[PDB]
């Protein structure tokens, strides 16, 4: 039942969207980050400065240790825990309980950071990313088996206030217009093929392989749109050619001072739209997801102020091109694993002052680009 899952996420892009889960017997309530960039279900198993609560295995009558540990490493951090299995209930969606693999984290580095509200992670990518190996069945694979739901989930983020994780399919109330689908190129991360980037209607004229050079992925656990260094350089170069920054004058004499704005004035009309072209399921065709400045020039301040400060929502990557939460905030995103495709549709919740912050259009021709842009 998909309607019961609407608004089951809390949080924001910056510190994560998270789903509430009840684990073990009696039920311990935890707050789980929704991460399409990893494949383990792992929760705090001991106190940590940046978490409120943790899962205590010794208090669940149903917990079973599987007799091995697990470790995860990524760019600037890592975590280690024990592996077992236990019963989980998802209050918003799945009132029946099911048995899942769980890693209980006892040690970590740059994983639980100050500012977060989650104390665990639900990795929704493929088994091939699971640690210690792909044989540790994924949470969503377990759910599919045990609840007999379709091998499809979709995500809407309304931080551009929470969002929705629909497990088992698509909820029609969460989009308008048509879903466009792009093939999953490799089933590990959710890797898709980017054909072209466009800044204010002007294409970057990089070899399309530059966008996929390592990989282009859809990652709800990354905050920003992250771009390989070369693509980043081209993007910000194009943004500077197309933008119209005010000139220095009375009360505005450094670049830094461009950050904050008073009297309802916003920086948006000074900035260009950004478009990513993805190949359609039909090879000859592509479609294009667009983000307006409303999405990548992001507000910063706590409530109750009469001014706003903003941050640029795009950053360099060393390897992956990451379609992070920045971008996913503009769209309803369907992870159709059953059919090896990712879908995008316009979110109606993705509006500012009743005006759209993102666009999706197609078809466009793919005649002028290589048949495969993934090197």
């Amino acid at each position, epitope marked *: 039942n998909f309607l019961a899952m609407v608004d089951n996420l809390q949080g924001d892009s910056g510190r994560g969207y998270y789903l509430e889960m009840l684990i073990g017997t009696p039920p311990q309530k935890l707050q789980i980050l929704v991460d399409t960039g990893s494949s383990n279900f792992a929760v705090a198993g001991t106190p940590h400065s940046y978490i409120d609560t943790y899962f205590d295995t010794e208090r669940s009558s149903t917990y079973r240790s599987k007799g091995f540990d697990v470790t995860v490493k990524y760019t600037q951090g890592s975590w280690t825990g024990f592996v077992g299995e236990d019963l989980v209930t998802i209050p918003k969606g799945f009132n029946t309980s099911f048995l899942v693999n769980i890693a209980t984290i006892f040690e970590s580095e740059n994983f639980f950071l100050p500012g977060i509200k989650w104390n665990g992670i639900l990795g929704l990518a493929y088994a091939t990313l699971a640690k210690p190996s792909s044989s540790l069945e994924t949470f969503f694979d377990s759910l599919v088996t045990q609840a007999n739901i379709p091998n499809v989930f979709s995500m809407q983020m309304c931080g551009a206030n929470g969002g929705s994780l629909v497990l088992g399919g698509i909820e029609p109330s969460l989009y308008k217009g048509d879903i466009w689908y792009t093939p999953i190129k490799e089933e590990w991360y959710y890797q898709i093929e980017i054909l072209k980037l466009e800044i204010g209607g002007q294409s970057l004229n990089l070899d399309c392989r530059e966008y996929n050079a390592d990989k282009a992925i859809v990652d709800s656990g990354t905050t920003l749109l992250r771009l390989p260094q070369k693509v980043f350089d081209a993007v910000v170069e194009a*943004v500077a050619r197309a933008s119209l920054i005010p000139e220095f004058s009375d009360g505005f004499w450094t670049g830094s001072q461009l950050a904050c704005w008073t009297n309802s004035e916003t920086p948006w009309s000074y900035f260009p739209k950004i478009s990513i072209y993805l190949r359609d399921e039909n090879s000859s065709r592509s479609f294009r997801i667009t983000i307006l400045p409303q999405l990548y020039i992001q507000p910063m301040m706590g409530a109750g102020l009469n001014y706003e400060c903003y941050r640029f929502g795009i950053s360099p990557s060393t390897n992956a091109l990451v379609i992070g939460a920045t971008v996913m905030e503009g769209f309803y995103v369907i992870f159709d694993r059953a059919q090896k495709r990712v879908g995008f549709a316009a979110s109606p919740c993705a509006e500012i002052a009743g005006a759209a912050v993102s666009e999706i259009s197609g078809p466009f021709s793919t005649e002028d680009v290589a048949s495969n842009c993934v090197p």
Partner: antibody
Amino acid sequence: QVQLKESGPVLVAPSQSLFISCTVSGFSLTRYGVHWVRQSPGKGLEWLGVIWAGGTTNYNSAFMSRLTISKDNSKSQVFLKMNSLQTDDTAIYYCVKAYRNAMDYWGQGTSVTVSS
Amino acid sequence: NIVLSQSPGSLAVSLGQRATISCRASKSVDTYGHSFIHWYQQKPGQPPNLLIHLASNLESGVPARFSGRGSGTDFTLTIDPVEADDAATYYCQQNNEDPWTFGGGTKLEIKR
């Protein structure tokens, strides 16, 4: 045609005060800021400060204890005054027209020597 | 104070060849994805003169032989192909923060 012309004392004794005028032409001080910049072998180019269209001044904080910039819109002039001169204030002093987020037109510069 | 460090201090390049000169800032000069750093040419006996606005926008009337790149803390000016008239010192200047600062400059020698 935009033009800026500096006029200062070619020579001034230490401790004494420096006063330079900048007479501008081809643009209005009611529409553009004017910056002051100096250049010396020992310190290279230093941005001293600026006076904007509306008369707001912003200064290089290293100089604020002794530097005053001002202008007279009706005389098309901008003024620099600096106190407590030292020999390493010896430099070419430029007035420069504000432009976008940088500077476009410079005067030819006036040579100032601080010594007795 | 953001400090700008140019390298090399001096460079000799043959007519028709490529000159590449670097500017490193001590702190990021970027806001809103724009780099508040600018390139000036100073020919002997003249004041400096703006060539590139905001890291990479070629000023109107400056030849297409000049181009600027970079973001964050690392910027380059490239002159290509180099001409005789290009004998001068080149300066970067930042104003992401106050005071506005200039780098120590790079003298381009034409290697005739």
